[PDB]
Design a protein around this ligand. Structure first.
Ligand SMILES: [Zn+2]
Length: 33
């Protein structure tokens, strides 16, 4: 446990800040295509 202060893409391993929820969801969404 290191405090969820950043999101990570399990598809390509792309990680971003916690405030990047927009890019984290959109990013994964791309892999969803
Ligand atoms: Zn990715």
């Amino acid at each position: 446990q290191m405090q969820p202060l950043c999101f990570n893409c399990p598809i390509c391993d792309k990680i971003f800040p916690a405030t990047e929820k927009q890019i984290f969801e959109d990013h994964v969404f791309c892999h969803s295509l």
